[PDB]
Design a binder for this molecule. Structure first.
Ligand SMILES: CCCCCCCCCCCCCCCCCC(=O)OC[C@H](CO[C@@H]1O[C@H](CO[C@H]2O[C@H](CO)[C@H](O)[C@H](O)[C@H]2O)[C@H](O)[C@H](O)[C@H]1O)OC(=O)CCCCCCCCCCCCCCCCC
Ligand SMILES: CCCCCCCCCCCCCCCCCC(=O)OC[C@H](CO[C@@H]1O[C@H](CO[C@H]2O[C@H](CO)[C@H](O)[C@H](O)[C@H]2O)[C@H](O)[C@H](O)[C@H]1O)OC(=O)CCCCCCCCCCCCCCCCC
Ligand SMILES: CCCCCCCCCCCCCCCCCC(=O)OC[C@H](CO[C@@H]1O[C@H](CO[C@H]2O[C@H](CO)[C@H](O)[C@H](O)[C@H]2O)[C@H](O)[C@H](O)[C@H]1O)OC(=O)CCCCCCCCCCCCCCCCC
Ligand code: CLA
Ligand code: CLA
Ligand code: CLA
Ligand code: CLA
Ligand code: HEC
Ligand SMILES: CC1=C(/C=C/C(C)=C/C=C/C(C)=C/C=C/C=C(C)/C=C/C=C(C)/C=C/C2=C(C)CCCC2(C)C)C(C)(C)CCC1
Ligand SMILES: CC1=C(/C=C/C(C)=C/C=C/C(C)=C/C=C/C=C(C)/C=C/C=C(C)/C=C/C2=C(C)CCCC2(C)C)C(C)(C)CCC1
Ligand SMILES: CC1=C(/C=C/C(C)=C/C=C/C(C)=C/C=C/C=C(C)/C=C/C=C(C)/C=C/C2=C(C)CCCC2(C)C)C(C)(C)CCC1
Ligand code: OEY
Ligand SMILES: [Cl-]
Ligand SMILES: [Cl-]
Ligand SMILES: [Fe+2]
Lengths: 36, 442, 334, 341, 34, 137, 82
């Protein structure tokens, strides 16, 4: 019902967004589309 | 009264918690200076110009005379390491006091001690705090004078021989020179205080500023605001914040122009060439190349009828031609040897250009401060290859943005401080709407 | 009843049909000077050598322009950022040839517009209002500073400021894109979103309030007569509007607090236009839009073009043609 | 009360996402237009239609990905999956540009579905249908730009491709080829879009700075109640302020909100008319009087002639790569260029 | 008493399910080399 | 298409001997060219003197021919004008002048080979783009 | 002001929800990854791999130039790679 506290769900979800987006920006400098 | 998104406004009348917020925030500032310097140093390569490496703090230290020798060559990186470690260490002490005063310390100070406690409306106390900080600032400016005169000097891009560290023995004290700057026009060829082009004036200005600040600090510790000042201002914490926001705004705009135009306290050796500098260097480069091929650059008429390489400014000075005609107010150490009383001297141009001047112009022309947000260097149509954005573009743009927002911050808090002081910041009283007791306009 | 106090009472009087105020004391002369010079120049000024190459550009109606092509032309590149008032010229003829009127107009206007913003604060204070309408206006004002002052400062010349004319504006735009790739700059992208979104929400709010007007008139009269100026009761049913819009999307995507809604209406285009003003203001220092030219190459190293490379082709065309006689050297560094 | 009424009942149940009869058209078509765009920008090339990479799979980023228009050789083919060009081969269909028609056609029917939804919900709730009427403006823009415009030209190829930078290319194409900034129908659109954004900001700010004090908190949001009868801000003070600041002010709350509907909707409708003209190359490209004088008098120069030189650079420099099916070979010596550059 | 499967449930997963699949595919793409 | 040994095969000297680079050497030479040369020679042009480019046909007609590894390695040690008549070490980066061009200090002999190999391979991939300038962007 | 569905905040803070979705989410992420790492995405969509935009000595785009032979034209371009 209200087990996992909401503020913990938001933190983990938010850091998951940061990870995925960060990996896309790393990819702008490596491999395809990096100009190298 | 305030929602969570305005939560720091709950600190307005909690002097002990507000002290913790300020001191913790100071630790953040000193932390960034410490960590950024180490990051820059960890990434530093001495064989590359600083401005090819995205450095903004190391160039500030080098300008003070630490770590560099003739020509701006980095000779010793240890002063960079020390400046960064000492800042980094000090942020722990400020963080420690900050969080203590914000969480555990007394919530308000005025019960604990009449010295440290304050009421925003106490004009005597407020000007006393101001005076203390004025003295600190005045000491701060004298530290730069101390470094320049007694502890090794400052880096001087104008020094004969390519630039070098130089002790300043004759700072300018003549107030006609020092205050003459404050009264120069900000327009082209004049440049207000941004035109300061020698270290003697820089050091002399800081002697003056230190004395004025210390004098003003003692003045404000000893006095209370006069009645004309009392009737002209709003006396509240938010009003004081709004005044400082306006001041920071003005200073950010000035700093923007300082880093964009000035190559004295922002040496091009470290920060790269200025916009005007790089544009002048391109004309120089092709003057040199064409003249070596046999071109008589003095007599060469360009497509418009103006000289292809050399023309006159609107007041007659011989200057570089092309679109760089706009940049003829540029002055720099690699170019001044070619200047006579009427501008660029054609005899010196024919006979006295040195290889070091050819190299420098080629270098500056190919490091003009143009680049993309993803750090592709050059004009916007250039292909990928060169990873470069000038430190001057980074420092100018960042501080223009900050200066703009702080001007908006000033408007926001100035208007609110006025409304709060008069009692209508929360909206219009339905039972006493001023317009309803006014006559109509028609 | 002192003479200075009587003047002071008139300047700040809330009974003047148009509020004057202390900001108005500066605003009224500077705006009149700028307006009068602009009208006269637009109609009659002779051609101006904007680029300093002795190639004058005709901007005024009497010299063969219409409303769309006419302009007050920016001042000569030979002047750069030098201050050029009338009394620095040997003659008005000189001052006109070199584009002196543009400087007089933009300086008087930026001063008068800045005081216009202050005047908005000032009257709000005399009427007992909240103070932040002037903060909304700082977004268009900052945009005017960017194209009239900031961009010339960073580029070194008022000759690269935006002309006071319709076709001159488009000229400024095209050249800006060739040299800064503004379309690929995120602050301009945010400006488009502030301007597109502002138009969207204007139409949304207008249609939702109009949709939920309470029946107060007959079919033979304008519904507008169902509202009387200064009536105490609201004129539409916000719960009905909320009930419609919440079902059009989903419930929690619709406002039912009018204060929150109108604050949102204020903030979206204001912040978007702040960013686009900041975009011009930072491209003034040549921090340009994203460059993905030749960012995709294949296993051998062949360039694989993207739409960014097509943009570059168009930008190259604008680059090579603009100011076709003003460049003697290969790089257009300013 | 037969099967039709029973279905009516279920479609109009009050639920988290209202469905309605309009939902039968809207939800499939909206989902497919959107899913088609995300699929194409993640996975699908434009190599065979444009000579362009255009997907994340190929190395593109969010700004450069696109679902690109079909090759010029397809004309205005519907490019049905089962049609004569792809012949039911899903892979060939992607490579020939079929996702573009898929998205444009499903998007069009989704827009219809959305406007019917606005009608349907308004009828059930009991409000006037002005939100639907305002939405006519985005519809006119979409159909004029994505359908009418390429239908007047040689092929779909010249419609906008669905991507950030592809649309940027569309803007610049229209400058250099149509001189679209010079077109009074676009200028009226500009005034409607910027006038709408102005009205949005100025109205929001005015309400927020003429509020009545209806609570004691410093956050003034809490002092509003959706069922209160009373106006939450002072129209009388707002009118006085603007009358003294600007000379004139609104006095009628109904006119004001109608005008906010009117200004951006009308602006968009005007621009759509101008694009319909450009479908036929019916441009406002030139002023004949300027051209006659400038041809005869080489000292006559305006911002108008300056811009046409820019347009000529754009055309000659982007056309070979932008219209690859035409096999334009422009030797270096024919390219228009000013001095040095 | 709350149902588990609703029209809402369908709409949510209609969007959420291919979204995570797509994020997985785009993540893998960051490691492709030419 | 791919980086095959045939494209990675470039002349070693004027005599006609050839050398076949590795992919690694090509990528190394591209990185080093960007580090030490691209600020003036991006895309095979010369920003400060556009009359002279890095196209193979241009290098072939220089005196000392420079369309081979040896000629290019020698140029990076002791650059001359295009006719061979004067040494230009004091205005052009080289090992002979690494005191005034500090980026040349830490280039080893194999770095020079990779840089030279990059310059010779790249026109084989890019064609007219290499040294063609903005017309071919 | 509710339509009878279970509130979202109740679902995502519930244990059972996380029991199911700590499996379903990584599985979907892994499936999408494999769609690319196995190369299936190239084949399904016909997207060139980095080695198959051009033939070895080829600098011409394989542009479709016929409406009704288009499918065959692509197929001939592909053969000329292998
Ligand atoms: C209290 C209220 C105050 C109100 C005051 C009202 C009057 C203000 C006047 C401001 C207008 C000034 C425009 C600046 C023009 C320009 O050339 O300004 C640049 C000048 C620097 O001038 C340049 O200064 C140069 C100095 O360099 C010289 O010296 C150097 C020394 O090393 C080098 O050698 C260099 O090569 C050499 O040329 C040269 O003189 C150039 O020719 C000259 O252009 O900067 C400056 O004076 C520094 C300050 C400029 C700040 C202006 C920023 C405006 C921001 C507006 C904010 C927008 C508001 C948003 C509203 C919403
Ligand atoms: C989900 C959301 C989570 C995150 C929320 C944050 C939202 C906003 C921020 C977006 C973050 C995404 C991008 C982060 C990665 C990035 O930027 O990555 C970029 C770099 C790291 O990348 C490095 O970027 C470098 C940039 O070049 C720099 O380094 C080069 C090589 O030394 C040259 O020296 C060149 O001149 C110099 O500019 C090179 O390209 C390196 O190869 C590359 O590794 O991070 C940096 O720099 C770090 C910069 C952060 C400090 C901010 C400073 C910016 C102040 C300038 C702003 C002025 C405003 C102007 C407005 C326009
Ligand atoms: C707002 C309302 C909202 C509701 C919107 C809902 C969206 C519904 C979906 C719309 C479907 C439209 C697709 C129509 C395709 C079309 O037109 O496709 C075009 C084809 C004609 O085909 C084209 O024909 C051209 C001319 O060919 C002719 O000329 C050649 C030269 O001699 C040869 O002789 C050739 O054999 C001969 O056929 C070229 O060959 C093109 O390549 C080929 O595509 O017409 C046909 O299918 C039919 C055309 C005739 C019927 C006209 C229908 C009107 C619709 C367009 C009206 C706008 C008109 C724009 C003008 C500006
Ligand atoms: C520089 C940023 C900054 C600083 C210094 C402060 C400081 C403060 N805020 Mg503000 N605040 C900020 C940003 C900041 N805020 C932002 C961005 C928001 C928007 C979300 C808010 C919203 C906000 C609200 C809504 C409120 C405050 C309040 C407060 C005060 C009490 C907070 C408290 O007791 O928390 C207690 C919190 C904890 C005990 C959790 C642990 C926090 C610790 C300090 C983390 C520090 C970790 C650090 C690594 C320690 C290093 C130790 C080492 C040096 C030895 C305090 C002075 C409150 C106030 O005014 O009270 C009257 C209040 O109500 N703030
Ligand atoms: C401007 C910042 C500032 C201000 C106004 C205050 C003010 C106060 N603090 Mg706080 N504090 C600060 C920073 C600050 N502190 C920092 C940085 C720390 C961490 C070290 C602390 C840690 C701290 C603790 C742990 C306690 C206080 C207490 C107090 C109160 C009594 C202090 C007293 O009588 O000392 C008398 C004055 C001195 C002993 C001064 C000695 C000489 C000093 C250190 C020289 C200063 C160095 C120089 C000027 C600048 C720094 C050098 C640097 C730039 C390299 C007073 C309200 C006490 C309190 O509230 O009691 C409940 C208490 O227990 N403070
Ligand atoms: C952080 C710095 C600071 C701050 C915030 C204050 C704040 C204050 N001071 Mg103090 N003051 C300071 C530093 C400071 N002072 C220093 C260093 C000195 C020594 C020189 C003095 C000397 C001083 C005196 C002698 C007096 C004050 C007074 C006052 C009060 C009224 C100020 C006023 O009306 O300004 C508004 C400014 C004016 C009315 C005139 C402005 C004229 C300037 C030069 C215009 C130029 C602005 C221009 C647009 C920007 C370009 C700069 C230009 C110079 C080129 C106020 C509490 C007054 C008071 O009540 O003291 C008890 C007073 O009589 N101050
Ligand atoms: C020294 C500077 C300074 C100081 C001390 C204050 C202090 C204050 N301000 Mg002011 N403010 C400032 C500058 C400053 N402001 C500037 C420059 C502006 C213009 C933008 C404003 C605009 C402003 C408004 C509009 C309001 C205040 C308010 C307030 C009060 C509440 C602040 C709060 O709780 O925020 C809490 C903090 C947050 C909610 C978070 C802010 C998050 C920012 C916007 C995001 C920045 C991200 C950054 C770009 C980096 C992105 C990277 C990514 C990883 C995030 C407090 C008295 C409020 C007030 O009037 O109270 C009396 C109020 O409503 N301020
Ligand atoms: C600007 C500061 C340059 C840098 C950095 C590099 N080069 Fe250069 N290069 C430059 C000029 C002005 C010239 C012409 C010199 C002359 O007057 O003859 C050159 C020439 C070359 C050549 C010869 C080209 C030819 O014969 O066609 C080569 C092979 C060359 N440069 C190579 C080169 C390398 C390998 C660099 C990085 C180590 C490099 N240059 C940097 C200007 C500049
Ligand atoms: C109040 C509050 C807040 C804030 C806070 C703050 C802001 C704080 C600060 C803090 C700080 C500011 C901290 C600091 C820290 C620091 C430290 C802890 C340091 C340490 C260091 C070290 C340990 C080092 C080491 C080294 C050396 C020595 C050498 C080199 C290397 C190295 C680096 C390793 C918040 C918002 C959260 C919330 C609310 C409340
Ligand atoms: C260091 C240096 C130097 C020097 C400097 C100086 C010496 C400075 C000074 C400065 C100054 C000396 C400043 C001043 C300032 C001022 C101001 C800034 C003012 C302000 C004002 C105001 C703001 C006001 C307002 C008002 C009014 C008007 C009305 C009434 C009300 C009020 C009050 C609000 C030099 C350059 C040489 C060189 C380099 C270094
Ligand atoms: C076409 C087609 C089809 C369909 C398909 C579909 C339907 C699809 C879908 C699809 C989908 C449905 C997809 C999705 C995807 C998504 C994504 C990929 C997303 C992403 C996102 C992101 C990246 C975000 C993030 C962020 C940021 C960045 C910032 C802020 C925060 C956030 C978190 C928001 C079919 C079968 C019929 C067949 C035919 C063809
Ligand atoms: O863009 Mn191109 O860059 Ca800024 O200057 Mn050099 O040319 Mn000219 O003055 Mn108007 O314009
Ligand atoms: Cl032009
Ligand atoms: Cl030039
Ligand atoms: Fe409203």
């Amino acid at each position: 019902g209200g087990r996992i506290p909401l503020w913990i769900v938001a933190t983990v979800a938010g850091m998951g967004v940061i990870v995925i987006v960060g990996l896309f920006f790393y990819g702008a400098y490596a491999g395809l589309g990096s100009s190298l | 009264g305030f929602a969570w998104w305005a939560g720091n406004a709950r600190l307005i009348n909690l002097s002990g918690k507000l002290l913790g917020a300020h001191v913790a925030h100071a630790g953040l500032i000193v932390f960034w200076a410490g960590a950024m310097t180490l990051f820059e140093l960890a990434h530093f390569i001495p064989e590359k110009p600083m401005y090819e490496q995205g450095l903004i703090l190391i160039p500030h230290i080098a300008t003070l005379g630490w770590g560099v020798g003739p020509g701006g060559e980095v000779v010793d990186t240890f002063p960079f390491f020390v400046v960064g470690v000492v800042h980094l260490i000090s942020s722990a002490v400020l963080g420690f006091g900050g969080v203590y005063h914000a969480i555990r310390g007394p919530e308000t100070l005025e019960e604990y001690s009449s010295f440290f406690g304050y009421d925003w409306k106490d004009k005597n106390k407020m000007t006393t705090i101001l005076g203390f900080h004025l003295i600190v600032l005045g000491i701060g400016a004298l530290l730069l004078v101390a470094k320049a005169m007694f502890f090794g000097g400052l880096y001087d891009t104008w020094a004969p021989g390519g630039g070098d560290v130089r002790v300043i023995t004759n700072p300018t004290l003549d107030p006609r020179v020092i205050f003459g700057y404050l009264l120069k026009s900000p327009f082209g060829g004049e440049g207000w205080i941004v035109s300061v082009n020698n270290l003697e004036d820089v050091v002399g200005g800081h002697i003056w500023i230190g004395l004025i600040c210390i004098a003003g600090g003692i003045w404000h510790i000893l006095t209370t605001p006069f009645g004309w000042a009392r009737r002209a201002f709003i006396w509240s914490g938010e009003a004081y914040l709004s005044y400082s926001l306006g001041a920071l705004s003005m200073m950010g705009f000035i700093a923007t122009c300082f880093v964009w135009f000035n190559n004295t306290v922002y040496p091009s050796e470290f920060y790269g060439p200025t916009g005007p500098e790089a544009s002048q260097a391109q004309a120089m480069t092709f003057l040199i190349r064409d003249q070596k091929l046999g071109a008589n650059v003095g007599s060469a008429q360009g497509p418009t009828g103006l000289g292809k390489y050399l023309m006159r400014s609107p007041t007659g000075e011989i200057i570089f031609g092309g679109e760089t005609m706009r940049f003829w107010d540029f002055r720099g150490p690699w170019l001044e040897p070619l200047r006579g009383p009427n501008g660029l001297d054609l005899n010196k141009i024919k006979n006295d250009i040195q290889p070091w001047q050819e190299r420098r112009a080629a270098e500056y022309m190919t490091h003009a401060p143009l680049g993309s947000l993803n750090s592709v260097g050059g004009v916007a149509t250039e292909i990928n290859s060169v990873n470069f954005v000038s430190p001057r573009s980074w420092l100018a743009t960042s501080h223009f943005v900050l200066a703009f927002f702080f001007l908006v911050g000033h408007l926001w808090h100035a208007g609110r401080a006025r409304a709060a002081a008069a009692g209508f910041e929360k909206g219009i009283d339905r039972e006493s709407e001023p317009v309803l007791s006014m006559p109509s306009l028609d | 009843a002192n003479l200075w106090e009587r003047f002071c009472n008139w300047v700040t009087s809330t009974d003047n049909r148009l509020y004057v105020g202390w900001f108005g004391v500066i605003m009224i002369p500077t705006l009149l000077a700028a307006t009068i010079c602009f009208v006269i120049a637009f109609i009659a000024a002779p051609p101006v050598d904007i680029d300093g190459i002795r190639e004058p550009v005709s901007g005024s109606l009497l010299y063969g322009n219409n409303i769309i092509t006419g302009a007050v032309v920016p001042s000569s590149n030979a002047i750069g950022l030098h201050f050029y008032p009338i009394w620095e010229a040997a003659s008005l003829d000189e001052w006109l040839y070199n584009g002196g009127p543009y400087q007089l107009i933009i300086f008087h206007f930026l001063l008068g517009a800045s005081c216009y913003m202050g005047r908005q604060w000032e009257l709000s204070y005399r009427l007992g209002m909240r103070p932040w309408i002037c903060v909304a206006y700082s977004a268009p004002l900052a945009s005017a500073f960017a194209v009239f002052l900031i961009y010339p400062i960073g580029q070194g010349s008022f000759s690269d400021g935006m002309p006071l004319g319709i076709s001159g504006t488009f000229n400024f735009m095209i050249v800006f894109q060739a040299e800064h790739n503004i379309l690929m700059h995120p602050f301009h992208q945010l400006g488009v979103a502030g301007v597109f979104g502002g138009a969207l929400f204007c139409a949304m709010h207008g249609s939702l309030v109009t949709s939920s007007l309470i029946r107060e008139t007959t079919e033979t009269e304008s519904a507008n007569y169902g509202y009387k100026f200064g009536q105490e009761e609201e004129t539409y049913n916000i719960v009905a509007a909320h009930g419609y819009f919440g079902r059009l999307i989903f419930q929690y995507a619709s406002f039912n607090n009018s204060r929150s809604l109108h604050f949102f209406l204020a903030a979206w285009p204001v912040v978007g236009v702040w960013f686009t003003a900041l975009g011009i203001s930072t491209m003034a220092f040549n921090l340009n839009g994203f460059n993905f030219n030749h960012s995709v190459i294949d296993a051998k190293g062949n360039v694989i073009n993207t739409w960014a490379d097509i943009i570059n082709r168009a930008n190259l065309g604008m680059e090579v043609m603009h100011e076709r006689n003003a460049h003697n050297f290969p790089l257009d560094l300013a | 009360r037969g099967w039709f009424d029973i279905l009516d009942d279920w479609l109009k149940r009050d639920r988290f996402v209202f469905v309605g009869w309009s939902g039968i058209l809207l939800f499939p078509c909206a989902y497919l237009a959107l899913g088609g765009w995300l699929t194409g920008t993640t996975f699908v090339t434009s190599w065979y239609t444009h000579g362009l990479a255009s997907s994340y799979l190929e190395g593109c980023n969010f700004l450069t990905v696109a679902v690109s228009t079909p090759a010029n050789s397809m004309g205005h083919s519907l490019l049905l999956l089962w049609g004569p060009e792809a012949q039911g081969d899903f892979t060939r269909w992607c490579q020939l540009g079929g996702l573009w028609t898929f998205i444009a056609l499903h998007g069009a029917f989704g827009l219809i579905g959305f406007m019917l939804r606005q009608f349907e919900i308004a009828r059930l709730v009991g409000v006037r249908p002005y939100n639907a009427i305002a939405f006519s403006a985005p519809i006119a823009v979409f159909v004029s730009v994505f359908l009418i415009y390429p239908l007047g030209q040689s092929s779909w190829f010249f419609a906008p491709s669905f991507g950030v930078a592809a649309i940027f290319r569309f803007l610049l194409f229209f400058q250099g080829f149509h001189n679209w900034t010079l077109n009074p129908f676009h200028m009226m659109g500009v005034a409607g879009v910027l006038g709408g954004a102005l009205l949005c900001a100025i109205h929001g700010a005015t309400v927020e700075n003429t509020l009545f004090q209806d609570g004691e908190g410093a956050s003034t949001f809490r002092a509003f109640n959706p069922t209160q009868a009373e106006e939450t801000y002072s129209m009388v003070t707002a009118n006085r302020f603007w009358s003294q600041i600007f000379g004139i002010a609104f006095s009628n709350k109904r006119w004001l909100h109608f005008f906010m509907l009117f200004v951006p909707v009308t602006g968009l409708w005007m621009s759509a008319i101008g694009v319909v003209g450009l479908a036929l190359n019916l441009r406002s490209y030139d002023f004949i009087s300027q051209e006659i004088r400038a041809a005869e008098d080489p000292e006559f120069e305006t911002f108008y002639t300056k811009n046409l030189l820019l347009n000529e650079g754009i055309r000659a420099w982007m056309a070979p790569q932008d219209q690859p099916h035409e096999n334009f070979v422009f030797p270096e010596e024919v390219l228009p260029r000013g001095n040095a550059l | 008493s709350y149902p588990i499967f609703t029209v809402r449930w369908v709409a949510v997963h209609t969007l959420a399910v291919p979204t995570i699949f797509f994020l997985g595919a785009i993540a893998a793409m960051q490691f492709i080399q030419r | 298409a791919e980086l095959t040994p045939e494209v990675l095969t470039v002349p070693l000297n004027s005599e006609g001997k050839t050398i076949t680079l590795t992919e690694k050497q090509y990528l190394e030479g591209k990185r080093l060219f960007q580090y030490a040369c691209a600020s003036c020679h991006v895309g095979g042009i010369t920003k400060t003197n556009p009359s002279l480019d890095l196209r193979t046909e241009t290098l072939a007609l220089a005196t000392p021919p420079r369309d081979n590894i040896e000629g290019l390695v020698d140029y990076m040690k002791n650059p001359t004008t295009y006719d061979g008549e004067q040494e230009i070490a004091e205005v052009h980066p080289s090992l002979r002048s690494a005191d005034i061009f500090p980026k040349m200090r830490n280039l080893t002999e194999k770095d020079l080979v990779a840089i030279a190999g990059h310059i010779l391979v790249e026109p084989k991939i890019l064609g007219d783009k290499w040294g063609g300038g903005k017309v071919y962007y | 002001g509710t339509t009878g569905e279970r509130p979202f905040s109740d679902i995502i803070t519930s244990v059972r929800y996380w029991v199911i979705h700590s499996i379903t989410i990584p599985a979907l992420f892994i499936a999408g990854w494999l769609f690319v790492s196995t190369g299936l995405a190239y084949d399904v969509f016909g997207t060139p791999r980095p080695d198959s935009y051009y033939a070895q000595e080829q600098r011409s785009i394989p542009l479709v130039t016929d409406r009704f032979e288009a499918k065959q034209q692509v197929e001939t371009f592909l053969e000329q790679l292998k």
